[PDB]
Design a protein around this ligand. Structure first.
Ligand SMILES: Nc1nc2c(ncn2[C@@H]2O[C@H](COP(=O)(O)OP(=O)(O)O)[C@@H](O)[C@H]2O)c(=O)[nH]1
Ligand SMILES: CCCn1nnnc1NC(=O)c1cccc(Cl)c1
Ligand SMILES: [Mg+2]
Length: 385
């Protein structure tokens, strides 16, 4: 029906993220329709687990006239680290809450940095607790600080919408402040562009399996992540070895022959001129020249704690774990940031990885870190090298 957008509140503890979330649901419900949620519901964050990693996360939903929002909110800075690196949803945009009284604080900076590292494309600022501040000059100063901070991490500080509001007053029914929640909603609508639907993006299919079908040749199977592959189209085979070219000479689903395969569908793609031996675990079919193989990259990683089922001991420079991208492990070596000799269970670090075989990747690609099958960490490619 409507574009689905992933958003969430970020910023320092006690600046009013949870209150703002409650106020957004409430104000949009009574204006546009929906179900209002209350501070104490959202504040009481349920614990969720995905492959060992425990995160206290609250999920709410709200609607504007044109868009539907899945909105994430977390109690602790520890959860934001985990959620941003390894969480289910990747954010299309974040709302940075900064309390007008305090101004920018350490976690304000950390979340902006993390935002950049994990590829959070857009940030909008809600300048909160403006009911506690009457001197307009001070609001301007706090705003300028935030704009500066955002620019430091390559966000367009000068151009980022900043809304002067009060989450509490708006949650309590003050129409004058509820108007500011609506201004924020407008910026979500207007400033975060409509998310590209997978079908519209360049074709990509991670290869899960391979067969030689009698009287046709080599078929590669998987789910179409993005785009459309049609019979006759050229495709590249990227990863593990030098990229290969071929033509799609068929798309099968179960027993039905199709002229194309679309994002979301599990299909078998027949490849002209390609042997079964020329297909390796970890490769993707891609629209020619739309995704490149890389061996070395910069990453933000979270290392599982003892409790989460991770390592007991810490690792050092000479650590060579399995890096799980899409379908398969690939061994790699690491380089740690200056003045770091060690990494403990539960730490998160910037980490430069060098893979032994290349993998098709762009910035934003998620991965797990494994030791003989068992997940010991998780991460996201921050910059390809
Ligand atoms: N005066 C005022 N207080 C607020 C506002 N928003 C939140 N608070 C208060 O700040 C405290 C922390 O808010 P909370 O939403 O829990 O912050 P979080 O730690 O970022 O989730 C609570 O006592 C709120 O009532 C506001 O706009 N004005
Ligand atoms: C949870 C699975 C990994 N795991 N779990 N418990 N310990 C480990 N890893 C190691 O012991 C280890 C052994 C030799 C060298 C190094 Cl660098 C690390
Ligand atoms: Mg909170």
């Amino acid at each position: 029906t409507k574009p689905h957008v992933n958003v969430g509140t970020i910023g320092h503890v006690d600046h009013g993220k949870t209150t703002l979330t409650a106020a957004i649901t409430t104000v949009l419900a009574k204006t546009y329709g929906g179900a209002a949620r209350a501070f104490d519901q959202i504040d009481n964050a349920p614990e969720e687990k995905a492959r060992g990693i425990t995160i206290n996360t609250s999920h709410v939903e709200y609607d504007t006239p044109t868009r539907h929002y899945a909105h994430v909110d977390c109690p602790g800075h520890a959860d934001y680290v985990k959620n941003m690196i390894t969480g289910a949803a990747q954010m299309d945009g974040a709302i940075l809450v900064v309390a007008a009284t305090d101004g920018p604080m350490p976690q304000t900076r950390e979340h902006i940095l993390l935002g950049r590292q994990v590829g959070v494309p857009y940030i909008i600022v809600f300048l909160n607790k403006c009911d506690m501040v009457d001197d307009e000059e001070l609001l301007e100063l706090v705003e300028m600080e935030v704009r500066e901070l955002l620019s430091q991490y390559d966000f367009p500080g000068d151009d980022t919408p900043i809304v002067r509001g009060s989450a509490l007053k708006a949650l309590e029914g003050d129409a004058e402040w509820e108007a500011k929640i609506l201004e924020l909603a407008g910026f979500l609508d207007s400033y975060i562009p409509e998310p590209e639907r997978a079908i519209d993006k360049p074709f990509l299919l991670p290869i899960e399996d391979v067969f030689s079908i009698s009287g046709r040749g080599t078929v590669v199977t998987g789910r179409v992540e993005r785009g459309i592959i049609k019979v006759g189209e050229e495709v590249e085979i990227v990863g593990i070895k030098e990229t290969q070219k071929s033509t799609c000479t068929g798309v099968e689903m179960f027993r039905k022959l199709l002229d194309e395969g679309r994002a979301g569908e599990n299909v078998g793609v027949l490849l002209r001129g390609i042997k079964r031996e020329e297909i390796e675990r970890g490769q993707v079919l891609a629209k020619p020249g739309t995704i490149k193989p890389h061996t070395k990259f910069e990453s933000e990683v979270y290392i599982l704690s003892k409790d989460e089922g991770g390592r007991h001991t810490p690792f050092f420079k000479g650590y060579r774990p399995q890096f799980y991208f899409r379908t398969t492990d690939v061994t790699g070596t690491i380089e740690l940031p200056e003045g770091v000799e060690m990494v403990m269970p539960g730490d998160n670090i910037k980490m430069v990885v060098t893979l032994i075989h290349p993998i098709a990747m762009d910035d934003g690609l998620r991965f797990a870190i494994r030791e003989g099958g068992r997940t010991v960490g998780a991460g996201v490619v921050a910059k390809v090298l």
